[PDB]
Copies of this chain bind each other. A is one copy, B any other.
Amino acid sequence: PIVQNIQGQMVHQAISPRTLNAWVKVVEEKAFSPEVIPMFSALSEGATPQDLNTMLNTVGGHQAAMQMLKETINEEAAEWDRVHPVHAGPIAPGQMREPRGSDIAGTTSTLQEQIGWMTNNPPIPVGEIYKRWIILGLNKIVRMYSPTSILDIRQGPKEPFRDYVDRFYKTLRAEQASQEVKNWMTETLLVQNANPDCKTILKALGPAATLEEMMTACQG
């Protein structure tokens, strides 16, 4: 990953081993959970496409998820090539030619070309684009690893309200269908699936009730 110097310029730097070790440990120990995407985005800030291909190929096990991510990256690369077509004619003296959909992934380009693309004038953020693609792939992976749907949630007669709302918000953050639909769900499905006693205790506060009073009602 590139790093700034005292004079202010940046240059390539070899990837640190205890980053690869931490990533492999968090991938295996925590498997796939919604909190692997923030860790991935924090571990590889400014990483070149070669470094991201390293961090992806290094993940032993769960090869189906890695193949899903590869397929998602594949489709994303094709869309980028289709959306922008290279221009023809003479090129300006102060400017030189851009990369392709497959070269954004870094599959068919050397490291020096990635460094030149990232530190050009103006800089080209290939690393950020490939990181966005990988984050989308990881979102789809954590969507697949969801153990239930959002509608099937029904609190048991003995399961406490805390565990119910924890499971609800877990599979809701793992749903990621949208943001306003999430806002409607947290109003309707949260109040619609409570245990009858605590259900009517929550109905005593009306729809204007917030989550804090919602839980301290059923509390104790």
Contacts and interface: CB of A to CB of B under 8 A. Distances in A.
A21 B20 contact: no
B210 A71 contact: yes
How many A residues touch the partner, as a band?
35 or more
Contacts of A200: none
A85 interface: no
A143 to B, nearest CB: 11
Nearest to A192: B151
Contacts of A216: 144
Interface of A: 4, 6, 11, 14-15, 17-22, 24, 30, 33-35, 38-39, 41-43, 45-46, 54, 57-64, 66-68, 71, 140, 144, 151, 162, 165-166, 169-170, 173, 177-178, 180-181, 184, 188-189, 192, 210-212, 215-216
Contacts of A66: 169
20 contacts: A4-B11, A14-B42, A17-B42, A20-B39, A35-B57, A35-B59, A35-B60, A38-B54, A41-B54, A61-B170, A63-B166, A66-B169, A67-B169, A68-B212, A68-B215, A144-B215, A151-B189, A177-B184, A178-B184, A180-B181
A141 to B, nearest CB: 10
B54 A42 contact: yes
Contacts of A17: 18-19, 22, 39, 42-43
